[PDB]
Amino acid sequence: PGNDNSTATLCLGHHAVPNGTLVKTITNDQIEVTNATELVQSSSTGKICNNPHRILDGINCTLIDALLGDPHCDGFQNETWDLFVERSKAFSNCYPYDVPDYASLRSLVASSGTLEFINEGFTWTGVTQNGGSNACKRGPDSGFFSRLNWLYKSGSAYPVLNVTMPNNDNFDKLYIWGVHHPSTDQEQTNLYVQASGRVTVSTKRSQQTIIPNIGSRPWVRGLSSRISIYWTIVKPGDILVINSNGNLIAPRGYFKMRTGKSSIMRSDAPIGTCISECITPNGSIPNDKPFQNVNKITYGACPKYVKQNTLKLATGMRNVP
Amino acid sequence: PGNDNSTATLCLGHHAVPNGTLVKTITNDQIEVTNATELVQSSSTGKICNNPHRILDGINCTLIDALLGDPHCDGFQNETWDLFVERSKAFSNCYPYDVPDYASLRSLVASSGTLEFINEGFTWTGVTQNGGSNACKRGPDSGFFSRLNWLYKSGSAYPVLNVTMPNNDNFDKLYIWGVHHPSTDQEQTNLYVQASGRVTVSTKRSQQTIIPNIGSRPWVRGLSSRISIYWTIVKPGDILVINSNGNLIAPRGYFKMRTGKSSIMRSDAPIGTCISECITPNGSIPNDKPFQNVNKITYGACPKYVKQNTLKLATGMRNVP
Amino acid sequence: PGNDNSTATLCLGHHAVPNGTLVKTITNDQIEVTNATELVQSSSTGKICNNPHRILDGINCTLIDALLGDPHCDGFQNETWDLFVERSKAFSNCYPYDVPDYASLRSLVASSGTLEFINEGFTWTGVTQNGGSNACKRGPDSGFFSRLNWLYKSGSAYPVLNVTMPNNDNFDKLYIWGVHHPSTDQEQTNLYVQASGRVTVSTKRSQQTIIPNIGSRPWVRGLSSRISIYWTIVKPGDILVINSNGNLIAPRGYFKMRTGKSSIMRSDAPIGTCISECITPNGSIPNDKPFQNVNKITYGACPKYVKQNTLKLATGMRNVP
Amino acid sequence: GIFGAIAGFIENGWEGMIDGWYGFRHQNSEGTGQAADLKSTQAAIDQINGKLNRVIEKTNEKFHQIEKEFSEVEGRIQDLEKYVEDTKIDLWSYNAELLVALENQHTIDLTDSEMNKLFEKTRRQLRENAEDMGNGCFKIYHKCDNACIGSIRNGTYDHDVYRDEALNNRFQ
Amino acid sequence: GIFGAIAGFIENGWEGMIDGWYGFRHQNSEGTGQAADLKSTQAAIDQINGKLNRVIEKTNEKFHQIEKEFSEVEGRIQDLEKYVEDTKIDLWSYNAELLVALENQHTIDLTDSEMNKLFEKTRRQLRENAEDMGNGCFKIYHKCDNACIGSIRNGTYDHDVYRDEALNNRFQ
Amino acid sequence: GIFGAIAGFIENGWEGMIDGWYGFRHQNSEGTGQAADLKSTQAAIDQINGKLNRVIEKTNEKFHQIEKEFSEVEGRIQDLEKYVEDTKIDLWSYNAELLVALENQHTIDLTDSEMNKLFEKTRRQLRENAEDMGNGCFKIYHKCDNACIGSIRNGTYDHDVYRDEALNNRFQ
Ligand SMILES: *[C@@H]1O[C@H](CO)[C@@H](O[C@@H]2O[C@H](CO)[C@@H](O[C@@H]3O[C@H](CO)[C@@H](O)[C@H](O)[C@@H]3O)[C@H](O)[C@H]2NC(C)=O)[C@H](O)[C@H]1NC(C)=O
Ligand SMILES: *[C@@H]1O[C@H](CO)[C@@H](O[C@@H]2O[C@H](CO)[C@@H](O[C@@H]3O[C@H](CO)[C@@H](O)[C@H](O)[C@@H]3O)[C@H](O)[C@H]2NC(C)=O)[C@H](O)[C@H]1NC(C)=O
Ligand SMILES: *[C@@H]1O[C@H](CO)[C@@H](O[C@@H]2O[C@H](CO)[C@@H](O[C@@H]3O[C@H](CO)[C@@H](O)[C@H](O)[C@@H]3O)[C@H](O)[C@H]2NC(C)=O)[C@H](O)[C@H]1NC(C)=O
Ligand SMILES: *[C@@H]1O[C@H](CO)[C@@H](O[C@@H]2O[C@H](CO)[C@@H](O)[C@H](O)[C@H]2NC(C)=O)[C@H](O)[C@H]1NC(C)=O
Ligand SMILES: *[C@@H]1O[C@H](CO)[C@@H](O[C@@H]2O[C@H](CO)[C@@H](O)[C@H](O)[C@H]2NC(C)=O)[C@H](O)[C@H]1NC(C)=O
Numbered sequence A, B, C: 001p002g003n004d005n006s007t008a009t010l011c012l013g014h015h016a017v018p019n020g021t022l023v024k025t026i027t028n029d030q031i032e033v034t035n036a037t038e039l040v041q042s043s044s045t046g047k048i049c050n051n052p053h054r055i056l057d058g059i060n061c062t063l064i065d066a067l068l069g070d071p072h073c074d075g076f077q078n079e080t081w082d083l084f085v086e087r088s089k090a091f092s093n094c095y096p097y098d099v100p101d102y103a104s105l106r107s108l109v110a111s112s113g114t115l116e117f118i119n120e121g122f123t124w125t126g127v128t129q130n131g132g133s134n135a136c137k138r139g140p141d142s143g144f145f146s147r148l149n150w151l152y153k154s155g156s157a158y159p160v161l162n163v164t165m166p167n168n169d170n171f172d173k174l175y176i177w178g179v180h181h182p183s184t185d186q187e188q189t190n191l192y193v194q195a196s197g198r199v200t201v202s203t204k205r206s207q208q209t210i211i212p213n214i215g216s217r218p219w220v221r222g223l224s225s226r227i228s229i230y231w232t233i234v235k236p237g238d239i240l241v242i243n244s245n246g247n248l249i250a251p252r253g254y255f256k257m258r259t260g261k262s263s264i265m266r267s268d269a270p271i272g273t274c275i276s277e278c279i280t281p282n283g284s285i286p287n288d289k290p291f292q293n294v295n296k297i298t299y300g301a302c303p304k305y306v307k308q309n310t311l312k313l314a315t316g317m318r319n320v321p
Numbered sequence D, E, F: 001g002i003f004g005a006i007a008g009f010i011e012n013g014w015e016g017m018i019d020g021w022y023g024f025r026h027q028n029s030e031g032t033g034q035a036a037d038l039k040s041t042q043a044a045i046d047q048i049n050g051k052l053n054r055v056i057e058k059t060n061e062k063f064h065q066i067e068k069e070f071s072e073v074e075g076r077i078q079d080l081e082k083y084v085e086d087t088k089i090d091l092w093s094y095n096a097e098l099l100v101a102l103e104n105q106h107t108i109d110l111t112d113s114e115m116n117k118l119f120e121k122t123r124r125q126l127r128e129n130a131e132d133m134g135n136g137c138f139k140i141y142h143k144c145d146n147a148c149i150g151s152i153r154n155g156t157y158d159h160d161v162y163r164d165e166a167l168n169n170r171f172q
């Protein structure tokens, strides 16, 4: 036994494994290789890691209610965030309101990244300040949005209000203000005397001018009346003018604007004590893979969303028995 | 003759054809192969196949006129569609109107896919109902949009109208309503008494409020007056409130909203008795090819639009004489 | 010395250079080749070449001020352009104004490519024409926008204005008009008698209707009043109607609309006496390369913007010592 | 004008082979002959059908989208709608152009490869009994009748049987 | 059921080689043996690690973007926001699909190439002292003990030393 | 420090070849010499010029588009305009990165291929008159003066003329 002593055989070969895996190529739809790796991240931990981004959990509050100063959102005064998280359980509990172009105000505040608020000494001659409502309880007393000033008649009139506030700073100022829509033609005169108020808020190059509308809306927290919320940004060197005949819900100051990496996300995922760069509404996901099919909504350093649930990259040669 | 009996020649070779075709590669701009196939669909039959998608031919009607109930569009009541087709010959023949954000209303109705309408028992105390116009003939009698209720003075006044309609259903309700703009300050009082009407339509979180504008517009079907059309969607659990001083063109009920695969297309292509998944305004096109340069506007399972009119995929080897 | 006379050696080889360059491949991140070429254009001359595109330098004027006819922009009357260039030093020097949806008017005028203006013989019965202001000096005399007609009371009244202008042409007509917002309830009556004017501008299918708002805005060139600018496009066969109670800033005619390759760019780059197809705000750039990272804003036949500052395409073999 | 000599794939295809993509032509004591090789033929076809199944791996189904033609001038929003769509089309047009170029390069490469693969397989069978003529053909240095050629095409050729005869013709 | 004959890469891999990707199996006077080739093994690994570094060349960081889910029906603007995002996802999904297919084709090609490259290198060493058996193996026509085989794997094999002995076994 | 022996493409390029991309170096009775091969040189150049014509297959002409820088904060619409443009740029940036990597891989492959193609062509000419030294060179086993080498480079080398002389030097 054994082979001839006059010759020898020398074979060249490559390894093979008993557990090959199928990948896709140009040539073939399913070819077996010795080993491969997943390029699509398809699982999440289910928790939003609170590191390294500053996560601000809105809890019962939308960012807009935190902005306006709905009393149960008072804890959010002057807060900052990389990512604000709005929860589905959030609720409003102040004067019933609407925001024409709600989404834009929510966006620009989210991106600014702070609710840093500065009080300015607006003088309001001839009107009563700090009106409160039973629909916006602040303890056991009637109350109102913290950042807003409900003005109304004094003595027995409401003089044409007319004030100015220059921006002598280096940053943009965001002013949030409002217009009150009473439910009855008798509610209107009772608060503001005039039978058709107006609110004009202007800078040098822009102006918004709103006329209220008397009428009943659906009962909300006792009320058929509404407030409509508007905003105005005043650039450095520009001037804010506020002129009103009545129905003005006045700002108490401005929010300091910033630019940066801040955003907002809707999610019910619990906040996690952990570390992850990529955040989705499902929770944080690892970012070792180039792609992911967890959620098209992401924040931070993330794999790119794709429709495939799996993409196998060969990392070894063809597997041949 | 014949070759030596001591040796032999064995040649290896590949086929070739006398009718090769030119394709493009990385290496060369025009290389001849034995055979190739077109990847760009560039022809249409010229007909929209009515299978397998439900095609609704608008004929003389835009989707919006079918929605409002322009009399010559009465045949479209409660219709449904996968794809609504609007024709260039379509015309309006009712009260002259405009829709602020026409495109959005057209879009959301198109996508909802039905004109399924449900009458609701609105009570309108103190006004006259069912006003009709000579510009919206319904037979030989003056008439109006089927889905709209032209309200006007009764006796000699027009009391502040003020009604509610809760959504206790599982689906979204779409309400279509309107505001009448008379041409003369004398037309205004004659219909509605008040000299400046208003229409406020509200839910719990939203409100629209419109003030009419007296003035002459271009004569259309006898009239310088106009109606402006608005809409309101009321979610399950929410409530619709309608408050008006005058000029209200009231809804008679709601359209049931759906989500799904429905859309709308502008085309003059005839409807065809045939079968095709992909529809373009030019007519249906086959979808065996991955790309097409027929039209960027498509509906259904379609090849992707590209600018090239031809792309040849080699399906055979290089052709060598 | 010398090799055997019985054999010979014949070697095959390829060239190599002493100055190889590194490129990126699928296989390796840095492989040395004999030669390569840059595919990303990363430099500009710093000048906008005035050939072959017609460049119109706005200098002290925005396109909108050239449109309205701000006196120091009078030199732009009836001008045309492939690319209008707006400079950061530009300023307004006429009646203080705003344009709701400024960006859209700027866009559609830019794309139309001309300020070709045609005077139409509007009759304005019962009002005074050609009002002028000290904030819009035209020499030493008070003046106004060239293309606009400031109408005001005659004798002691301002009759309901009500005029028409049909489009019997083959092109779209663009009408620019305005609404005046006085600063005091006493300024309003003094100009227009009525205490709340209105401007309704309509065609057959569309209408805009604007109500002025009395109130002080920030002092600009002596004034707390403003004008708000609107536009209306009238298609061939359609009709323009203008109805106003007061505060109407009337058009004097229309701008002829075109379609084509015209646009607008913001740049402070000097205009250059040279030739270049591709224009960026940095100045013109060559277009021999497929990509460029100079600016995402471009006009003309340009390389595509990418984030990389360099991409080296091998144009020679691997360089081996 | 030389008819008589047969030649292989080196810069010439065979218009006369209609029952296969690759094959053998021979010349021996019994005359000439030709036979397709189905295996390499099937291998090329399978690969090409695969690409052509993946390229046609079924269209995307889209329903309600955005408008893409406009009867009125509108400015900012329409500008954006047109730009979004123009951007999409240019990117897909690029994808299509590149795909076809890459795929055609690959189709040519894999078809050339099958050809060379069949040549090397034949060469390995022949061992020391043949020489590469340089034109895609082997000179077989021994009497190889039709049955013999058949054994080569069939993969059952035993080089040992002819080795002595061939080595003798090649050298001494 | 034939155990005894060893065979090379031609349509068979070696499950028993666990210390390398490529290698040699030999049979000689002293029995059989096996040894990995680290160099070709490292070359394949380096290339694969490179692609897998470039594919994972770090994620894109995005912060505030656009909304992608909506609680209310809105029409034109929402249509556009959804269309923009659907367009982006389809294009990236395409990019990913193509990348993986291309990269996997290349991974297979470069691993096959390393194999063939090691075969040709060995063949060049052996000159006229061996013949290609056709199965990925060389028949070495001379006594080649373990040290001899070692010199081949080691690249220090001197063909001249064995040339006379081998030519004699191959022919006369 | 060995000057005297010439060597071929196997892990070394020739810095001294400035009139071509590929070529021959020889050593014979008359000394040494060098000559470029224009055909394989032209073939590489043509292929590279083609890619570089297709890559530069003329820019896209764009005119009025959307705005891409903004002096005012605006929210939803501006968000969308920025997102549309950021999306476009990332996709084109990806296209460019991939194109260059693929094209450079291909450029290297086709240039290597031309090299090996010229080697195999030469080998086919030489038949049994030469052996592969393993370093990109052939040992020609017969007197081959400058004219002889020339006939090889020229493709007119007749292997039969030298066959007896060479077989005798190779073996007996
Ligand atoms: C099958 O293929 C996968 C493809 O990645 C191989 O997984 C990779 O294995 C390498 C080597 O163990 C890992 O690299 C190492 O990462 C650590 C992390 O810090 C580093 O410290 C080491 O120096 C080394 O770079 C790599 O992370 C890992 N990849 C994954 C996704 O797990 C795997 O080895 C292959 N399997 C076999 C049996 O060959
Ligand atoms: C030239 O190349 C084209 C590339 O596709 C070849 O066309 C294709 O030919 C095959 C075989 O006949 C067709 O496949 C068949 O389709 C039917 C349809 O149901 C199926 O029942 C069969 O079992 C088979 O799968 C394929 O459809 C056809 N493609 C096209 C676009 O026509 C063509 O054969 C080539 N020409 C030559 C002469 O080789
Ligand atoms: C290194 O690689 C680059 C890659 O392009 C080579 O540059 C190119 O050289 C060719 C030949 O000189 C140029 O083509 C010529 O262009 C002129 C312009 O009109 C034309 O008249 C000629 O007939 C010819 O087509 C080409 O423009 C040039 N490309 C660039 C970007 O400069 C370069 O030659 C290579 N270097 C070496 C030493 O090989
Ligand atoms: C992450 O969350 C998203 C939704 O926020 C999930 O996507 C939904 O998946 C369910 C079940 O497959 C579908 O019925 C929905 O239609 C999906 N919604 C959307 C918007 O696509 C997703 O499955 C979650 N993924 C993980 C890994 O948790
Ligand atoms: C399908 O219809 C479109 C238009 O709906 C055609 O595109 C037009 O083609 C004409 C003639 O080439 C051009 O003048 C127009 O500018 C094109 N319009 C657009 C919007 O691009 C297209 O040619 C038709 N194709 C087929 C196969 O019928």
Ligand SMILES: *[C@@H]1O[C@H](CO)[C@@H](O[C@@H]2O[C@H](CO)[C@@H](O)[C@H](O)[C@H]2NC(C)=O)[C@H](O)[C@H]1NC(C)=O
Pocket: C042, C043, C044, C281, C282, C294, C295
């Ligand atoms: C072309 O101009 C743009 C801006 O118009 C330059 O981009 C800016 O570059 C500076 C310095 O690197 C940065 O601080 C800014 O953030 C950049 N702006 C933007 C919008 O990206 C660009 O560098 C210029 N390029 C050339 C070649 O002149």
Ligand SMILES: *[C@@H]1O[C@H](CO)[C@@H](O)[C@H](O)[C@H]1NC(C)=O
Pocket: A059, A060, A091
């Ligand atoms: C959120 O609101 C619920 C009532 O809706 C309340 O019970 C809960 O305590 C609130 N959470 C916080 C943190 O205040």
Ligand SMILES: *[C@@H]1O[C@H](CO)[C@@H](O)[C@H](O)[C@H]1NC(C)=O
Pocket: B059, B060, B091
């Ligand atoms: C559509 O309108 C035309 C008149 O414009 C009419 O003649 C035709 O009969 C109408 N078509 C239908 C189906 O009613």
Ligand SMILES: *[C@@H]1O[C@H](CO)[C@@H](O)[C@H](O)[C@H]1NC(C)=O
Pocket: C059, C060, C091
């Ligand atoms: C532009 O305006 C400045 C003043 O701001 C003036 O000095 C300059 O002459 C103007 N340029 C032209 C061309 O009128």
Ligand SMILES: *[C@H]1O[C@H](CO)[C@@H](O)[C@H](O)[C@H]1NC(C)=O
Pocket: A077, A078, A116, A117, A118, A119
């Ligand atoms: C938040 O910051 C502002 C800015 O200095 C400060 O004036 C204010 O008092 C702070 N409020 C709280 C609740 O910290």
Ligand SMILES: *[C@H]1O[C@H](CO)[C@@H](O)[C@H](O)[C@H]1NC(C)=O
Pocket: B077, B078, B116, B117, B118, B119
């Ligand atoms: C359409 O459907 C609604 C919903 O049930 C029904 O009430 C109505 O009568 C139907 N109308 C027609 C014309 O079929």
Ligand SMILES: *[C@H]1O[C@H](CO)[C@@H](O)[C@H](O)[C@H]1NC(C)=O
Pocket: C077, C078, C116, C117, C118, C119
């Ligand atoms: C500009 O063109 C219009 C159109 O003909 C003409 O009426 C007008 O007088 C021209 N104005 C100037 C300043 O050239």
